[PDB]
Amino acid sequence: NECQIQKLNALKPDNRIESEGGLIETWNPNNKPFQCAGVALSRCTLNRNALRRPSYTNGPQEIYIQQGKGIFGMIYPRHQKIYNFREGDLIAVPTGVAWWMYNNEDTPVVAVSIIDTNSLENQLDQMPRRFYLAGNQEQEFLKYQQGGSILSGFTLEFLEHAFSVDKQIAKNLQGEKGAIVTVKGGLSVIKPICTMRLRHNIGQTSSPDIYNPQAGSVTTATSLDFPALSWLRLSAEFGSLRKNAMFVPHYNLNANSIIYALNGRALIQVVNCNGERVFDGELQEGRVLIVPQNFVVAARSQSDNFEYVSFKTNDTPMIGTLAGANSLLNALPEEVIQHTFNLKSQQARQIKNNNPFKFLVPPQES
Amino acid sequence: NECQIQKLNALKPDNRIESEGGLIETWNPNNKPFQCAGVALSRCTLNRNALRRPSYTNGPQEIYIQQGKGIFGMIYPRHQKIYNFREGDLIAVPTGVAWWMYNNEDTPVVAVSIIDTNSLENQLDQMPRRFYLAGNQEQEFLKYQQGGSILSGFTLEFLEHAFSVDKQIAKNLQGEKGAIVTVKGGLSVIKPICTMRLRHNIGQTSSPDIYNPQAGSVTTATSLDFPALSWLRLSAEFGSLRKNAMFVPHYNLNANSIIYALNGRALIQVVNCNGERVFDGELQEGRVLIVPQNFVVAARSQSDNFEYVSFKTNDTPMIGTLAGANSLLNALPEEVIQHTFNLKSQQARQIKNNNPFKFLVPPQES
Amino acid sequence: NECQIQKLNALKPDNRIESEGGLIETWNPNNKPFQCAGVALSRCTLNRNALRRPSYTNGPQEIYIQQGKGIFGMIYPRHQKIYNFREGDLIAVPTGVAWWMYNNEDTPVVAVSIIDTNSLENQLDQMPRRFYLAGNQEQEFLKYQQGGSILSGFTLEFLEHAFSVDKQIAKNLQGEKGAIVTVKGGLSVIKPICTMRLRHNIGQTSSPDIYNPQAGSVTTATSLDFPALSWLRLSAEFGSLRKNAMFVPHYNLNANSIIYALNGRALIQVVNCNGERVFDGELQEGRVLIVPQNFVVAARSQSDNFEYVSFKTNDTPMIGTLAGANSLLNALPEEVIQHTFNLKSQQARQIKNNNPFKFLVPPQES
């Protein structure tokens, strides 16, 4: 039983793959928190003039840009559409679509992303895989399984024939720097379903779904406002939490959350169906906590601010708040709350009215 | 191979939790019939003035009320809309939604429900598990796994900050009588997707799909006549059969079935793909018979009347009756039926016309 | 990991079942190619006056007709609708629907087909299994499990009562020549969702998708063209390639393919996520090669013509062409092609335009 977890730990990457102008970090997909969740996380950072070479995957992928500005281009089945991006942006990558990424400024692009290996679209097995169009490099997840591109595996005679070019150029196509190359002079490529928009900024926005000036803000990107996400059946949440503010106990009725802290630190508590407090610790920058589906999560911030991206596995996730304005205890008859918690008619009124805030709750004022 | 079943058996519960104002019985989900079916069956019984404390699961539940009257409430993501139930009601509970159940009559409410652990909505694993909003009590299925509520696992200052209450009522709220709890005086709460009907009656009271004055009647609730079921991707079927009558051999094209014998006793026969009669015997009251996807069933009523609830795992189950007005042999040309059964034309007609009834056949007439 | 394929081999059946008027051959569903793919291939040939007795499976089935003409009737939940078929007809058989087939010419019908055991519609297990309506004989896939039909498993009094006939025509119904019997005189039943067409032609008698008078043609049947396929979540592709012409390196973004060679031979090459060439060999008639989801495939015909059928597990498969008019590299900016392959502007142009052809490229001409 994958999801029968006794103790969640804040996970770190166990794989660093330094390339010419970048780095690839990957988290072990065979640790039970990731086996339960069904995703595979990764963190690609691309330095100035770096170009992530073309690659595709056997599952939906959703990329969050932690920092940097670049151009990302998809090759959906001169040249196709190139999309500009910024920090805060959420990029949708439908199953098997090949894409590439380039950074041009000093400030390295750091993009953290998830491959939902447990998707219905993933017709292979639960192993994450990346198929690169070029270069002779071992793909990020090869270590977990246990190199070349998909093009280098072909015989020269076949490439010569398919491309209709001579043996000499066929040799370069056949392999012969890792995934993230550095462009010497830099690309001079123009700065701006085939219609589908796959870029929706949830980080550096000014339209919070929930906004509390004394507690923080929380933005979400569901398929409602970011419709390419229905193709992925994936979601993402960006939250900024002030010091000692909190996000009330809650649960995702229909989704698995992968909380990746972008900044600061926060003390978190997740409890299960048995009431066991499976994680009672702190989650820091660049670390990850996986909250399984109906497990309840609570967080109190320790920084100004605690920012995070929670990749949920459902394009329309539904959260059930256990405390605050729209809670599950609030929608209860004042009498049943009395008999399930063993309370007085006066106490039940406090549990149902004392916190007027939705989702985010302000510091206690100590 | 989980559904490669040798011999089935009319199963009775293995677990029992006597609660202050009621009881809970659960069938072992780790039995091959149940692993094959991909469901977790249990039967709660609410005594007079009992309340069932709010809980929720990672899967589409479908409750059936064997007997009783009362009011049930669902806390979707003063208070929310309560619905009144009577026996023969089918309640649809979406994945993850919390619900509470209350009985006021002397008569105990009996409800048999399944949890489709093999749902698409179930992102965890094949374990059944309930998430109780309150109390200190071990969840029904913990047994199978091998405490408290989700609230009793949290910290006092987390709970105080969350609910914005004093440490005295937060400590109550923190779990400090099992799942079912008697309301001493009794609730004063009335007896009359937010607007979606999630209760339908398939009791004898309801107009049946099939009615034969000498055989019985069959009423089934699908997503066409009960639309909320297209959310649970589940459905149910009530059936009453006069003594010695029988429902013809038939198979569900697209759904596993979980026959719960409510009243009386019967003599069922289910045969598989290899022609092996994997069950020949009797399914009596309070017992369960699992009949997989294309396995053919036939039952002779040994009582006036044998009554059942068949939980199908599909919102629009399609059945393929082998003998009847509607049957497969009937749609077969007389000549091709001659040749598959080594028969004369005139005998072939007997097979396509002797029995003129749909699904139900009157007693043999002896 | 089921799809961690080391080496693929051009598979062939390991099970011959000679019947009275025909034959049934099947491929082992437990090899890693088929476990990875998630299907069950089979090839039934019926000779003159042969009838394939009524049956059904617990999954989506897609039947392609290699050769011959006959009729096939469906018995969807006098008689039902019978369709005539010819070579190149792709019959969509929705989950659990019972059907029978008949042939009346000297030329045997050779119908190769697939049962997708990894379907959402399949609620049993991954073991393929056919349920026969009549006759004592063992089911094609019983060999893989480790008989008689579903009717010959009931107690003689149950059939008697059910069909409302006597002990004698009840024995003839209760079993007392295999699945494909010979209809001595001949089935005189006239040669012509209820109305949803489940026969569509893709063979050499069609108006092709891709056509090149020097390379061949490719005709694809998706749910766009044949709407009954969206029920199956399956597709097929018929291709005819002239000697030495080739279909460029390409991958299916969302499907597994089961390439069954109809006529001739071809030198096929498929490579994986690690640039390993998992298959470098010849695929000839009656043999089959499984190209898992994002694996790249390229073939070069060694015959006039190499004809194949490609069962893809997705009703709307999207392919990524790596070389050709509409290829992935064709859409890449000349400058990123220069930097990902280590080429110059001019060479980059040669890879984008030397092959002016979509998917099929002609002989090299030497």
Itemize the secondary structure elements and their pairings.
Three copies of one chain form a homotrimer.
Chain A: E1 15-19, E2 22-26, H1 32-37, E3 40-46, E4 50-56, E5 61-67, E6 70-75, E7 82-85, E8 89-93, E9 98-103, E10 109-115, E11 131-132, H2 142-145, H3 156-163, H4 167-173, E12 180-182, E13 199-201, E14 210-212, E15 216-221, H5 229-232, E16 235-241, E17 246-252, E18 257-263, E19 265-271, E20 277-284, E21 288-291, E22 296-301, E23 306-312, E24 319-321, H6 336-341, H7 347-353, E25 360-361
Antiparallel strand pairs in A: 1-2, 2-3, 3-10, 4-9, 4-11, 4-12, 5-8, 5-10, 6-7, 6-9, 8-13, 14-15, 15-16, 16-23, 17-22, 17-24, 17-25, 18-21, 18-23, 19-20, 19-22
InterPro entries (chains A, B, C): 11S_seedstore_CS, 11S_seedstore_pln, Cupin_1, RmlC-like_jellyroll, RmlC_Cupin_sf, Seed_Storage-Functional
Pfam families (chains A, B, C): Cupin_1 (PF00190)
Subcellular location (chains A, B, C): Endoplasmic reticulum; Protein storage vacuole
How do you describe this structure in short?
Chains A, B, C: Belongs to the 11S seed storage protein (globulins) family. The structure is a homotrimer of 366-residue chains. Chain A has helices at 32-37, 142-145, 156-163, 167-173, 229-232, 336-341, 347-353; strands at 15-19, 22-26, 40-46, 50-56, 61-67, 70-75, 82-85, 89-93, 98-103, 109-115, 131-132, 180-182, 199-201, 210-212, 216-221, 235-241, 246-252, 257-263, 265-271, 277-284, 288-291, 296-301, 306-312, 319-321, 360-361.
Task: Report what the structure shows.
The structure is a homotrimer of 366-residue chains. Chain A folds into two domains: 13-202, Jelly Rolls (Sandwich); 203-366, Sandwich (Jelly Rolls). The first copy, chain A, starts with 14 loop residues before the first strand and ends in a 5-residue tail after the last strand. In chain A, the strands form four sheets. A seven-stranded antiparallel beta sheet of chain A has the order 1-2-3-10-5-8-13, with no helix packed on it. In chain A, strands 4, 6, 7, 9, 11 and 12 form a six-stranded antiparallel beta sheet that branches. In chain A, strand 19 and strand 20 form a beta hairpin. Chain A has helices spanning 32-37, 142-145, 156-163, 167-173, 229-232, 336-341, 347-353, and strands at residues 15-19, 22-26, 40-46, 50-56, 61-67, 70-75, 82-85, 89-93, 98-103, 109-115, 131-132, 180-182, 199-201, 210-212, 216-221, 235-241, 246-252, 257-263, 265-271, 277-284, 288-291, 296-301, 306-312, 319-321, 360-361. The first copy, chain A, has 366 residues and is mainly β. Chain A is built from seven helices and 25 strands. Chain A is elongated. In chain A, helix 3 (156-163) packs across helix 4 (167-173). The interface between B and C is large, with 61 and 66 residues.
